[PDB]
Design an enzyme around this catalytic site. Sequence first.
Site, PDB file in Angstrom:
ATOM      1  N   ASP A 192       4.873   1.270   2.585  1.00  0.00           N
ATOM      2  CA  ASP A 192       5.511   2.567   2.796  1.00  0.00           C
ATOM      3  C   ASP A 192       6.280   2.573   4.111  1.00  0.00           C
ATOM      4  O   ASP A 192       7.509   2.480   4.093  1.00  0.00           O
ATOM      5  CB  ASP A 192       4.477   3.693   2.740  1.00  0.00           C
ATOM      6  CG  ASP A 192       5.112   5.068   2.816  1.00  0.00           C
ATOM      7  OD1 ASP A 192       6.121   5.296   2.115  1.00  0.00           O
ATOM      8  OD2 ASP A 192       4.604   5.919   3.576  1.00  0.00           O
ATOM      9  N   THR A 193       5.598   2.666   5.253  1.00  0.00           N
ATOM     10  CA  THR A 193       6.304   2.674   6.529  1.00  0.00           C
ATOM     11  C   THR A 193       6.729   1.277   6.959  1.00  0.00           C
ATOM     12  O   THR A 193       7.775   1.122   7.599  1.00  0.00           O
ATOM     13  CB  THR A 193       5.434   3.309   7.617  1.00  0.00           C
ATOM     14  OG1 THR A 193       4.114   2.754   7.565  1.00  0.00           O
ATOM     15  CG2 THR A 193       5.348   4.813   7.416  1.00  0.00           C
TER      16      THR A 193
ATOM     17  N   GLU B 202      -0.946  -7.164  -1.253  1.00  0.00           N
ATOM     18  CA  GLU B 202      -1.093  -5.893  -0.567  1.00  0.00           C
ATOM     19  C   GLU B 202      -1.142  -4.716  -1.527  1.00  0.00           C
ATOM     20  O   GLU B 202      -0.640  -4.769  -2.651  1.00  0.00           O
ATOM     21  CB  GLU B 202       0.049  -5.683   0.423  1.00  0.00           C
ATOM     22  CG  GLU B 202      -0.389  -5.699   1.854  1.00  0.00           C
ATOM     23  CD  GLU B 202      -1.228  -4.494   2.203  1.00  0.00           C
ATOM     24  OE1 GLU B 202      -0.937  -3.399   1.681  1.00  0.00           O
ATOM     25  OE2 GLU B 202      -2.176  -4.635   2.999  1.00  0.00           O
ATOM     26  N   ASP B 203      -1.765  -3.644  -1.041  1.00  0.00           N
ATOM     27  CA  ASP B 203      -1.733  -2.330  -1.677  1.00  0.00           C
ATOM     28  C   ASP B 203      -0.313  -1.919  -2.037  1.00  0.00           C
ATOM     29  O   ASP B 203       0.057  -1.818  -3.211  1.00  0.00           O
ATOM     30  CB  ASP B 203      -2.284  -1.247  -0.737  1.00  0.00           C
ATOM     31  CG  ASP B 203      -3.536  -1.679   0.015  1.00  0.00           C
ATOM     32  OD1 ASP B 203      -4.597  -1.048  -0.169  1.00  0.00           O
ATOM     33  OD2 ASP B 203      -3.457  -2.651   0.791  1.00  0.00           O
ATOM     34  N   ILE B 204       0.488  -1.713  -0.994  1.00  0.00           N
ATOM     35  CA  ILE B 204       1.696  -0.907  -1.066  1.00  0.00           C
ATOM     36  C   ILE B 204       2.402  -1.000   0.277  1.00  0.00           C
ATOM     37  O   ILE B 204       1.757  -1.150   1.321  1.00  0.00           O
ATOM     38  CB  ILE B 204       1.349   0.553  -1.416  1.00  0.00           C
ATOM     39  CG1 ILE B 204       2.614   1.370  -1.681  1.00  0.00           C
ATOM     40  CG2 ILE B 204       0.528   1.191  -0.307  1.00  0.00           C
ATOM     41  CD1 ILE B 204       2.414   2.400  -2.747  1.00  0.00           C
TER      42      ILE B 204
ATOM     43  N   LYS C 216      -8.950  -2.809   2.230  1.00  0.00           N
ATOM     44  CA  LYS C 216      -9.876  -2.762   1.100  1.00  0.00           C
ATOM     45  C   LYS C 216      -9.210  -2.415  -0.231  1.00  0.00           C
ATOM     46  O   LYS C 216      -9.595  -2.935  -1.277  1.00  0.00           O
ATOM     47  CB  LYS C 216     -10.991  -1.755   1.407  1.00  0.00           C
ATOM     48  CG  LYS C 216     -11.549  -1.027   0.204  1.00  0.00           C
ATOM     49  CD  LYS C 216     -13.060  -0.987   0.267  1.00  0.00           C
ATOM     50  CE  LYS C 216     -13.542  -0.073   1.374  1.00  0.00           C
ATOM     51  NZ  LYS C 216     -13.195   1.348   1.108  1.00  0.00           N
TER      52      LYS C 216
ATOM     53  N   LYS D  14       7.533   1.514  -1.672  1.00  0.00           N
ATOM     54  CA  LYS D  14       8.353   2.703  -1.454  1.00  0.00           C
ATOM     55  C   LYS D  14       9.319   2.439  -0.306  1.00  0.00           C
ATOM     56  O   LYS D  14       8.941   2.586   0.868  1.00  0.00           O
ATOM     57  CB  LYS D  14       7.489   3.929  -1.146  1.00  0.00           C
ATOM     58  CG  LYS D  14       6.011   3.807  -1.478  1.00  0.00           C
ATOM     59  CD  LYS D  14       5.274   5.014  -0.906  1.00  0.00           C
ATOM     60  CE  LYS D  14       3.879   5.175  -1.475  1.00  0.00           C
ATOM     61  NZ  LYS D  14       3.175   6.364  -0.917  1.00  0.00           N
TER      62      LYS D  14
HETATM   63  O1  LIG Z   1       0.799   6.151  -1.194  1.00  0.00           O
HETATM   64  C1  LIG Z   1      -0.193   5.498  -0.875  1.00  0.00           C
HETATM   65  N1  LIG Z   1      -1.371   5.659  -1.574  1.00  0.00           N
HETATM   66  C2  LIG Z   1      -2.535   5.089  -1.102  1.00  0.00           C
HETATM   67  N2  LIG Z   1      -2.525   4.360   0.070  1.00  0.00           N
HETATM   68  C3  LIG Z   1      -1.373   4.198   0.763  1.00  0.00           C
HETATM   69  C4  LIG Z   1      -0.191   4.761   0.305  1.00  0.00           C
HETATM   70  N3  LIG Z   1       0.788   4.444   1.180  1.00  0.00           N
HETATM   71  C5  LIG Z   1       0.253   3.698   2.175  1.00  0.00           C
HETATM   72  N4  LIG Z   1      -1.086   3.533   1.929  1.00  0.00           N
HETATM   73  C6  LIG Z   1      -2.064   2.793   2.752  1.00  0.00           C
HETATM   74  O2  LIG Z   1      -1.703   2.925   4.108  1.00  0.00           O
HETATM   75  C7  LIG Z   1      -1.226   1.653   4.628  1.00  0.00           C
HETATM   76  C8  LIG Z   1      -0.001   1.881   5.475  1.00  0.00           C
HETATM   77  O3  LIG Z   1       0.946   0.838   5.300  1.00  0.00           O
HETATM   78  P1  LIG Z   1       2.497   1.092   5.557  1.00  0.00           P
HETATM   79  O4  LIG Z   1       2.764   2.536   5.207  1.00  0.00           O
HETATM   80  O5  LIG Z   1       3.249   0.018   4.808  1.00  0.00           O
HETATM   81  O6  LIG Z   1       2.768   0.912   7.033  1.00  0.00           O
HETATM   82  C9  LIG Z   1      -1.025   0.781   3.392  1.00  0.00           C
HETATM   83  O7  LIG Z   1      -1.141  -0.604   3.669  1.00  0.00           O
HETATM   84  C10 LIG Z   1      -2.080   1.303   2.428  1.00  0.00           C
HETATM   85  O8  LIG Z   1      -3.362   0.786   2.756  1.00  0.00           O
HETATM   86 MG   LIG Z   2      -7.826   0.509   3.307  1.00  0.00          MG
END
Ligand SMILES: O=c1[nH]cnc2c1ncn2[C@@H]1O[C@H](COP(=O)(O)O)[C@@H](O)[C@H]1O
Ligand SMILES: [Mg+2]
Lengths: 217, 216
Positions: free
Chosen positions: B133-134, B129-131, B82, B162
Amino acid sequence: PLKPNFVGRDADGNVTVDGRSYPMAESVVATESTIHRSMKEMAQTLANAYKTLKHRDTHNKGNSALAPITDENPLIIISVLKGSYIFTADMVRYLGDCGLPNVVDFIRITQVLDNLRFTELTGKHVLIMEDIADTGRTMKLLVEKIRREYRPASLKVCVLVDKPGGRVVDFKPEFVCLTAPTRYVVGYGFEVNDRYRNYRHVFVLKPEYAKRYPSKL
Amino acid sequence: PLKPNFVGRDADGNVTVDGRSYPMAESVVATESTIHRSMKEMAQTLANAYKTLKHRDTHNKGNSALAPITDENPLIIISVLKGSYIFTADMVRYLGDCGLPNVVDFIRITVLDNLRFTELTGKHVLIMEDIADTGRTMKLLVEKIRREYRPASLKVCVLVDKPGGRVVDFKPEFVCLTAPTRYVVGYGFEVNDRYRNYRHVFVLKPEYAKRYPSKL
Ligand SMILES: O=c1[nH]cnc2c1ncn2[C@@H]1O[C@H](COP(=O)(O)O)[C@@H](O)[C@H]1O
Ligand SMILES: [Mg+2]
Ligand SMILES: O=c1[nH]cnc2c1ncn2[C@@H]1O[C@H](COP(=O)(O)O)[C@@H](O)[C@H]1O
Ligand SMILES: [Mg+2]
């Protein structure tokens, strides 16, 4: 001030908005200059109508009194996919400028296809964000179904474009940004098989383009 | 010419961008000034990578040749609900400014709500995509969307990235911003859906992550 977009024509004879030709367009309802001011002006219209209100507390649900509209209990916005996601993303950004806190969730209808993730709407002030109301049947039933199963303190509808001439039933949205002719419009979220959604202005589509992309996606 | 947003401080000492206060914020990753030009630099980066390409012809599917990316065989954008609906709303408007034909559909994952586009086989598809991280989330989806639809290409565009929080091997081919390894908020990023409609990306104060625990 307002720096409005100019509307003219090209050498080919297509409708242009500030130099970019739009062969799909027959007319131009409102351009992004006119569309965007309909929102910052309605973001305050919504801010003036929701900021004093008090509804059910959910931050501290061990509370028998109504809390105001804070960040702890923000106004609930239900956006109707797939057309109002641009209209909403621009709208909720304007509501922050006016200081009305909100939280947004989505709904997909054709009658639920994809459903909300929100659960505590009972006794709340809810606000549907829709792209356009033509016949009124889609939003007439949707507020019945929301008001029925959730029973909010208030559920009003805010749409960008409103053609009140195509109404088969009685649906009068409480907050309307633009009033358009009884015509099929494209742009700013309006689609013809998902085409022309990303156009910054709302044009009246040439009927010659009515089924230009019949292939399913 | 770019008109950047000024970033000062309150009388209380909170983060201030254009005179408006943000007690939620510890710093400012990037303001609307820098975020928006970042997308107009990707909308052309995305354009040059997709405009002179071809893929399966589903418009004139009675024929066999490959067709260029036009309004009849456009780029298939998969927008991950979302917290992504704003970044993909501002970008596809920049994509049209670069003349790139597109069509967008929304997926919601942990899959929860599914796509409704069906003919993605042999297509050029694009995740917004949002972002990152992992990387688990966006690598699983690529392993998913690839297996289900078998497109001619499946590339990921993300607004923020990140690389420090990476658990697995994910490398987005299109990034607008690179941020430090901590929680962001503003412009689609959230704490339980709050601050999502703010036009600047701040780094969250750790004392605010648990501020609003109740479910909506
Ligand atoms: O720092 C952040 N702020 C807000 N949402 C985040 C942040 N990091 C990860 N997310 C959310 O958590 C999900 C985890 O994705 P991943 O960390 O790439 O595996 C992301 O697709 C976002 O929806
Ligand atoms: Mg979401
Ligand atoms: O003028 C328009 N341009 C593009 N789509 C429209 C227009 N008017 C109605 N629609 C679509 O048709 C649906 C039916 O709405 P209704 O006519 O109010 O029941 C809407 O939810 C929109 O998706
Ligand atoms: Mg729609």
